[PDB]
Amino acid sequence: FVPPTNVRDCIRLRGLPYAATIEDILDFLGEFATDIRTHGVHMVLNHQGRPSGDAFIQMKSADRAFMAAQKCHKKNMKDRYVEVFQCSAEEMNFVLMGGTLNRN
Amino acid sequence: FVPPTNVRDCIRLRGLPYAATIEDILDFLGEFATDIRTHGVHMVLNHQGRPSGDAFIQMKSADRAFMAAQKCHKKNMKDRYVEVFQCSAEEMNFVLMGGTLNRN
Amino acid sequence: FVPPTNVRDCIRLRGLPYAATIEDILDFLGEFATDIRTHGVHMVLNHQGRPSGDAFIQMKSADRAFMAAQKCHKKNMKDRYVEVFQCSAEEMNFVLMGGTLNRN
Amino acid sequence: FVPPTNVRDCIRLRGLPYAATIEDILDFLGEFATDIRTHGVHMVLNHQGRPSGDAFIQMKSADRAFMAAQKCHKKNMKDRYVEVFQCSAEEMNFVLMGGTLNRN
């Protein structure tokens, strides 16, 4: 199965500290926190239902997702460097139903 | 408009501490953490895009959502009593697009 | 009700990052930290009693409040561009008793 | 000069961590965050205009200030154990105009 990638308006955060708060995530986005679409940030659970270190956020456009990833990929949060990956909503929703993304 | 309530298999957490972690939310659910259906916990932003203190979680059934609310409603998390409300996925998704739930 | 606006010797900070401290605020003000009047800086709660991201500071004169706004408006603090608005003490005190400033 | 002390409806927090935020103060107060009066928390400057480590908050009653002090005095916040002292508004406003309290 190839999750569709035509519209990449989401970001995945990977490597979040176990102690990350919602404020830590919004401060890490900085000016990009106003470019979030919807009223939710998705904290991801792994295949055992446990904290993954991952989160997904839908942005207002693919270009805002691209610029957030450019600015924030490997940026510091609580002395960990957090990965930021531009992705599609299908990729996000595939992971939320238990899928594994191979694209990196 | 009132969102449908036929299938009440979700829970809303209200009054989370500002520094709540995903671990603190799963510990708060306790035995009901294994009854989460998807691989996501939704941290809710208000109409200014700021943290609301709410979260939504989809459960494996309406009975498990009822039992979680029965046990966890007004339980302590870091000295705040957190409310737990059994709700439908339509109510959750309405709030995630900016709606206000009048059922309480 | 529109609060008096004749003596604009205060500043409002808006859009402070979640991580903002009192040290961060004084460092952000730079040369204007010496123009602060009293021994307090007001951190503002919103209508629900939650953090707003706003602060108020009284300065020793309108001209120094003006200059703090002119030089610090939309300056960076920890990856947010913080708004700095010149205002009166009546405007500040109105907000501190739960009023809204319509003037921008 | 000894400021009036008959109505002790404020609390002084002393020894705040360098990284303290308004969210950290509200989480620290727990249930007592809802008993704050006004929409301000006062962060205190020392006589060289730098952070003192102190903050003052007015509460809705003298007994709620007593109860916040009883629960929170020397409670942990980050790397500090923060003192909480029940005091009057005259004691608070005396300190905010550069006064020293000689009561403990």
Next chain:
Amino acid sequence: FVPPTNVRDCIRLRGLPYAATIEDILDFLGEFATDIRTHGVHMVLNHQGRPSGDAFIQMKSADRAFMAAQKCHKKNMKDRYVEVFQCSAEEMNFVLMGGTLNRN
């Protein structure tokens, strides 16, 4: 490969709450805390190097491991029913070098 099981003087804790501390583990064992053998408790990392929620403790005899498991298996720690499994030191050391126990 089958790890030897002749001498089952260890216990595995599984499903520890995320807030569990070493003080919590010792308090949960109650009367059995004095039957711990060495000066160490092992907190287990999963196949990704991330927390598992498991721990291993070597006891002073198989009978004390059996009695500790009898008393403490599915006992409450901070709203989790924590699993307590009697096992051998070979089983414990096999898991610590990356092995998976098939015995439950």
Next chain:
Amino acid sequence: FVPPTNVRDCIRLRGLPYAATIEDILDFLGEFATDIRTHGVHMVLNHQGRPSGDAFIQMKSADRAFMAAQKCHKKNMKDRYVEVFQCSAEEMNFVLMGGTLNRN
């Protein structure tokens, strides 16, 4: 007796917080969490079988132990500034059988 200290591929953490969890220790190590060699973190007990405040971790090489100690020695975790000391497996195993490690 002095334990051998020729191969220094372990780290000792000293002065851990009372409330420390395994997730707090991994967050503290950050990038060096992937440099842990076995699947266990050893939490150390004193002669009364209560927590000593120490932990030991075997790393994949002496160079990774050195780098982790360089970065993390006296770094903050919760209420504490945790010491990180590069040591040998014999030093670690001497302490796990009740020895007092004099080298510092």
Next chain:
Amino acid sequence: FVPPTNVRDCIRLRGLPYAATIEDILDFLGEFATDIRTHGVHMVLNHQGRPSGDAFIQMKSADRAFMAAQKCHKKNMKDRYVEVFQCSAEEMNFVLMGGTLNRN
């Protein structure tokens, strides 16, 4: 040279938080605060002239120093396990002039 140990009417506190106050120490001692003999608490500097976390207090008798150590040894102060060791005035004076005690 080993300092004389015949009259053990002092206590050594060890593992204080470096931000420890005299009120912290008196409150920790509880009933034994009134068993202090001199009008002083001797806060100890380390070999670099920095805070050690140690203090010495001369008590009214060896009997009262023994009972203080029985009741207060490893009792909690601000999430530390504070050690209380019964010792002689010669041991105290030896440490104050830069000696190291080899009795524990």
Next chain:
Amino acid sequence: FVPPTNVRDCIRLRGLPYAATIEDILDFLGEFATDIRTHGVHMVLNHQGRPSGDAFIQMKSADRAFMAAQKCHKKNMKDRYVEVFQCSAEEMNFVLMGGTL
């Protein structure tokens, strides 16, 4: 009775903050923290057994006690201006056995 003052190689801090710490005292002394003699800082109790707000410290010389008092007397520490007096060890030991200066 007046304790002797022939050798004034100590400092008395008076009017410490209620919650005075060793770290506050060393910071306040600035360069003079390295001119302390012995490994002790003496925090004083009043006649009720409670912290008095006084401390005594022996310095490496009378002139270093003079210089520490000159620099630090009425300097800020937290919310207080702390008094610093050059004094003798006899003054220190007199107060430690319950005397009033």
